RNA sequence: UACCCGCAGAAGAAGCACCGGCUAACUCCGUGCCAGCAGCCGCGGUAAUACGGAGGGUGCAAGCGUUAAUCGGAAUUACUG
RNA sequence: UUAGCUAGUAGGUGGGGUAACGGCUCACCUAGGCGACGAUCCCUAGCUGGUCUGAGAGGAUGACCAGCCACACUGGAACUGAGACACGGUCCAGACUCCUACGGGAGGCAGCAGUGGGGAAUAUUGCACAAUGGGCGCAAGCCUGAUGCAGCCAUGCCGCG
RNA sequence: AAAUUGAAGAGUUUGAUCAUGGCUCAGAUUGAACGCUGGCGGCAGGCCUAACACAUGCAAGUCGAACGGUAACAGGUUUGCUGACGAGUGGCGGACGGGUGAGUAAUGUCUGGGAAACUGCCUGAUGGAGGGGGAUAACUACUGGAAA
């Protein structure tokens, strides 16, 4: 039970408000006609029903850099990607975004141009943006016979033919006649220019086309092939997905210009586990079974719904598998492919195919699921690190027990989103690739879970230091009245240590001299000293950086204690330190942003208005690298400003560097 | 209830979801109950080759 | 002609028994509510386990009134009790998932089509 | 206490 | 299908608790009332068979420990007693 | 740390009623009836053969197998039929959920498999009526998530490497 | 002939002792769980919790040798003519089997009795089974509803 494999994977990668929703709606519509987000399979021969109908695999990708994990998992399993671009926007942000996450993953794509109809829209225009802002070769595989309020249809470069569909029928019928003489004029350069596209791939008939012998549409249309393949050319077509005029036909070049599973290079992988050795599994069903896990969901009246693409082998169901990354045995069974009208069971999965596997108990995203006889392990899809962190606090107290829970379900299915408890403040702190991002997810734990929540800012984990040394401060502990008290006294010297002397920052000196304090009892005072660091006196945050010197004492014969000696150093402790100049710290944060070089000087600016001090600036070939040195408190929602600034065509990294102390207003803010 | 950690190393913070188990620790009044080490949020012992199962740890790969 | 102080017995499920019109909103010094117009108002009793618990304030749609409507003909539909449907505060959607006793076709809006539609009776 | 890096 | 035969080759197949006493089974090293241990007693503040590890042993074994629960020992509700 | 409880209550007589006896019901008559051998009330609970443990007496227990009882969304009621006040029947009322063209309609896994949820924790949306049963039919046959098996699981026992 | 021929102690109150008296341990068991580990077969068991809510498929049908009829299939434009039977009338089963333990301290269950009863199918016996009447489904025509 095997199609020949001439399904085309495919996944509609487009900027936000371009068409992706329409025009796989549209593609839905036209497939389902042929017949008598999520994965969905349809059917599509030609127009004409020239092509043997083939399996479609379509996903609309979302376009938001917030949703950007679920475009990176979508092209690495599918085989083809078609790109929309609105006609109005030509190549904006987003869409300049999800071209180089096709150029990670070396996937063949082709171009829709949407919203013809629109006014002030050029199809020209979009393909001259594709060319600059893309750095890529667009190839006319249509041209657009009407433009804007007089768009009437898109004629065909390769047939050199108009083609009218019908308003009546909603698109359903196509129809062929003669370019019209003005359109003629400039559609002949444009089908010279693919003529020669064609040709370059080839080699044998760029010879024959210099000679002058007209090529075959047999073999440009294979030479278009050929390119697309190599990611050398891109694709062009026209339509309006809203005017039911061009979606049809750029399903027909998606077929015949767009790769089977067999024709992208086979997955790679290390082979078992160590040695690194390649697994270099070949797609095809008689290689050992191997999978991945895309879009894991959860369904009330099913089993959780593992999305997953067997590039060779076949699954049955009761199959045992093996979690290559995760080390779990699992076993395979309830298998659903969701066709556009409805989800139906299927015993099997042939390779070069997408599915849910029902109920996979320990499958997460970015597993590998392979037969356990002959294992592999595929590599993990690329995971984005977080960009924007807020702090969540239950609404209730009760909704703390549950909260957790959802935040955990929601970052089972999510790799992008993150949850953790800071150690100091413990609180719920999410991590998340856009604000709209983290938004959605608090909903979701709302609307889907019944857990509401507030948002906050993460609390900041200031720390304490001593400016100024201040000499013979002396604490004495007396607790005589009657049988056994508890006595000792230790006079000693706090001085601020330096920042990079030691690794613990503190530094206890043993610099008694006689008989002054016995050897027993320094060690409880050093013990009593560590503990006071643990909460400093003004604002209870972490002493560092301070050392301190014992240098006299006293003692009792019965009195005397560890205990005693302790509780005096504590009290000599707080005494220095309230005279020692107490300053807090705040964390600071080395800071690497890449941006465009016309929003440096709104970036530069945006640092400097944070209490963020510049070290560096780099020109670098593609973007500019601005290094500056800013406090985490300052470093909240900088992506939303920074995207803000820049077009969203900015990304910074950060690593916490060292505690430098915080400006009057601010510190005075953090103690009170 | 109160329940104990037991091993060198606790991860334990707040609104950590654990498994707790019978047990008293006799020099501590009031705690009946000993948490389970390497069940739900609670890890194993580092560095521990011996009684590995009582704290949860994996058998060492050699 | 529901008045600030007036109390409704509830047409849904969400558990109110009761309910008093705190406020007559859409108007500033508005002073009547009538069959289609949306009030605030506070639980004055409430079923145990319900969706909704006693002092709760929220909005409400009034659905059948004792004054009546009047219908273009001039006739007049008129009820023996003056009876609402609560309403979320935000979005203004039936907190209850069933309708209780008949509804005018008042409220065939489209903000109360979900109401319209689990109705026993509409007249 | 601050972003995913953990770090204040 | 059970079963039987033929082939190849030691190949494909051992772990878990415990060693102060009660209770079978001991030393060293780290550590220094700390870190931990513990059913009960209790151990640990510089020669720790009681902690953490190593070697050695012991018990059981495709299991081995731990927790929970029932009865026994408990003549510790005693009819026997 | 529940002492009083009862009025169709307790009995008689007549009528009705049921397959049958009977305050079963009704009229009248009498003033009874239960209860420190614990009535009434309150809490808990399917019961048994058995099981676990104990020398025994006993203590704990009632999963599996078999007998019996009860129940079938909740509350009530009848119909048909030898037999039900009926799991996959009917009517009503109630909570809940679903379909709709917005006029109205529909339903009840404590059948088997399965999903969510709860929980420390418990299995496959498997196959076949080949056998043994059951229903229908003269039989052939058909129907049978009874049953026979298969999957999952060191969950136990047992045997072996 | 054989069919219970069956009962053990130890640690810890004291400076030591004896008694009292708890605590704890050695045994067996389990619808177990968890932690670590895991070659295999046989046999058994497997929501103990929410009698919580349930998407979907299936779990009660059968009889043409009761009856009209023949939709459909197969043979001998056509028919019930035949096999065979959709739908329908009729009979029978559906009260069995399967599930669960919510209720229930006795109206249930167990033990032994009783007297005032019923009982499809099965079975033994003795007979009969006479002769009519009216109706109705399906069906046909018309008509309503999204469906039911
Ligand atoms: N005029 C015009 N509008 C369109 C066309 N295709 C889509 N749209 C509109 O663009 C809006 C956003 O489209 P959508 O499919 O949501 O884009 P997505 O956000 O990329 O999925 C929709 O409301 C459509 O009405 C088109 O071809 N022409
Ligand atoms: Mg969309
Ligand atoms: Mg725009
Ligand atoms: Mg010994
Ligand atoms: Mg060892
Ligand atoms: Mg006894
Ligand atoms: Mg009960
Ligand atoms: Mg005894
Ligand atoms: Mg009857
Ligand atoms: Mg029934
Ligand atoms: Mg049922
Ligand atoms: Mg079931
Ligand atoms: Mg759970
Ligand atoms: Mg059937
Ligand atoms: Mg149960
Ligand atoms: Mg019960």
Redesign the pocket.
């Given at each position: 039970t095997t199609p020949i494999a001439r399904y085309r994977n495919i996944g509609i990668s487009a900027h936000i408000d371009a068409g992706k929703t329409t025009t796989t709606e549209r593609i839905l519509f036209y497939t389902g006609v042929n017949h008598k987000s999520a994965a969905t399979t349809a059917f599509w021969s030609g127009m004409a029903k020239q092509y043997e109908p083939h399996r479609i695999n379509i996903i609309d990708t979302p376009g938001h850099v917030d949703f950007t994990i679920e475009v990176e998992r979508s092209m690495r399993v599918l085989d083809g990607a078609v790109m929309v671009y609105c006609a109005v926007g030509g190549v904006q942000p987003q869409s300049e975004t999800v071209w180089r996450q096709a150029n990670k993953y070396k996937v063949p794509r082709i171009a829709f141009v949407n919203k013809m109809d629109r006014m002030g829209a050029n199809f020209l225009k979009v393909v001259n943006q594709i060319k600059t802002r893309l750095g890529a070769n667009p190839v006319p595989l249509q041209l657009a016979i009407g433009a804007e309020e007089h768009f009437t249809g898109v004629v065909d470069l390769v047939k050199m033919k108009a083609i009218n569909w019908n308003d009546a029928d909603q698109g359903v019928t196509f129809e062929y006649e003669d370019i019209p003489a003005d359109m003629v004029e400039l559609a002949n350069e444009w089908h010279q220019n693919l003529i020669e596209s064609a040709a370059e791939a080839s080699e044998e008939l760029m010879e024959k086309y210099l000679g002058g012998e007209e090529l075959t549409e047999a073999e440009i249309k294979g030479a278009l092939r050929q390119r697309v393949l190599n990611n050398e050319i891109i694709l062009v077509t026209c339509g309006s997905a809203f005017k039911n005029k061009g979606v049809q036909a750029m399903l027909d070049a998606v077929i015949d210009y767009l790769p089977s599973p067999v024709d992208v290079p086979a997955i790679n992988g290390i082979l078992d586990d160590g040695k690194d050795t390649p697994a270099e599994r070949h797609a095809s069903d008689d290689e050992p079974f191997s999978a991945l896990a895309f879009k894991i969901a959860?369904?009330?009246?099913?089993?959780?719904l593992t999305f997953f693409r067997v590039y060779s082998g076949v699954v049955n169901?009761?199959d045992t598998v093996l979690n290559s990354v995760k080390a779990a045995r699992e076993?395979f069974?309830?298998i659903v492919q969701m066709h556009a009208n409805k989800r139906e069971?299927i015993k099997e999965v042939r390779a070069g195919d997408i599915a849910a596997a029902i109920?996979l108990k320990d499958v997460t995203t970015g597993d590998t699921l392979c037969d356990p006889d002959a294992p592999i392990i595929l590599e993990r899809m690329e995971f984005p690190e977080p960009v924007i962190s807020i702090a969540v606090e239950p609404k209730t107290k009760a909704d703390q027990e549950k909260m957790g829970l959802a935040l955990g379900r929601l970052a089972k299915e999510d790799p992008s989103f993150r949850v953790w408890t800071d150690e100091e403040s413990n609180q719920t702190i999410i991590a998340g690739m856009g604000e709209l991002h983290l938004d959605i997810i608090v909903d979701r734990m709302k609307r889907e879970f019944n857990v509401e929540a507030n948002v906050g800012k993460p609390q900041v984990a200031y720390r304490e230091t001593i400016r100024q040394k201040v000499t013979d401060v002396e604490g004495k502990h007396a607790k005589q009245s009657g049988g056994r008290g508890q006595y000792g006294h230790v006079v000693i010297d706090m001085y601020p240590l330096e920042p990079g002397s030691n690794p613990k920052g503190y530094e206890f000196i043993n610099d008694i001299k006689g008989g002054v304090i016995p050897g027993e009892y320094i060690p409880a005072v050093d013990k009593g000293i560590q503990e006071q660091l643990k909460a400093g006196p003004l604002a209870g945050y972490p002493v560092v950086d301070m050392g301190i010197r014992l240098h006299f004492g006293s003692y009792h014969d019965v009195d005397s204690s560890?205990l005693a000696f302790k509780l005096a150093a504590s009290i000599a402790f707080k005494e220095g330190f309230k005279k020692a100049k107490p300053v807090l710290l705040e964390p600071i944060m080395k800071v690497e942003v890449e941006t465009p070089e016309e929003n440096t000087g709104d970036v530069i600016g945006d640092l400097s208005r944070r209490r963020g001090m510049l070290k560096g600036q780099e020109s670098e070939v593609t973007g500019v690298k601005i290094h500056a040195e800013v406090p985490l408190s300052e470093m909240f929602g900088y992506a939303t400003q920074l995207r803000s600034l820049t077009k969203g065509r900015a990304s910074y990294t950060m690593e916490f560097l060292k505690y430098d102390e915080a400006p009057s207003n601010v510190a005075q803010a953090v103690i009170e | 209830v109160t329940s104990y950690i037991?091993?060198?190393?606790?991860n334990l913070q707040e609104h950590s979801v654990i498994?707790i188990?019978?047990?008293?620790?006799?020099?501590?009044p009031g705690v009946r109950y000993?948490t389970?080490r390497?069940?739900?949020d609670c890890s194993?012992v580092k560095?521990?080759?011996?009684?590995?199962?009582?704290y949860?740890?994996?058998?060492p790969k050699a | 002609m529901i008045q600030e102080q007036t109390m409704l017995n509830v047409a849904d499920?969400s558990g109110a028994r009761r309910v008093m019109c705190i406020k007559v909103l859409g108007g500033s010094h508005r002073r009547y509510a009538g069959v289609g117009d949306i009030i605030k108002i506070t639980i004055k009793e409430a079923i145990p386990r319900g969706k909704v618990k006693k002092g709760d304030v929220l909005k409400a749609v009034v659905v059948r009134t004792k004054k009546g409507v009047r219908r273009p003909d001039g006739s007049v539909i008129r009820f023996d009790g003056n009876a609402c449907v609560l309403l979320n505060n935000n979005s203004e959607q039936p907190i209850?998932?069933?309708i209780?006793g008949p509804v005018t076709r008042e409220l065939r809006s489209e903000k109360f089509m979900k109401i319209?539609?689990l109705a026993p009776?509409?007249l | 206490x601050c972003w995913w890096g953990x770090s204040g």
């Open positions: 959860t369904d009330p009246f099913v089993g959780n169901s009761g076993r069974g309830r069971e109920g560890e | 037991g091993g060198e190393g606790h498994l188990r019978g047990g008293r620790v006799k020099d501590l000993h389970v390497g069940a739900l194993g560095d521990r080759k011996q009684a590995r199962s009582k949860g740890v994996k058998r | 499920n209850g998932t069933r209780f319209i539609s009776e509409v | -």
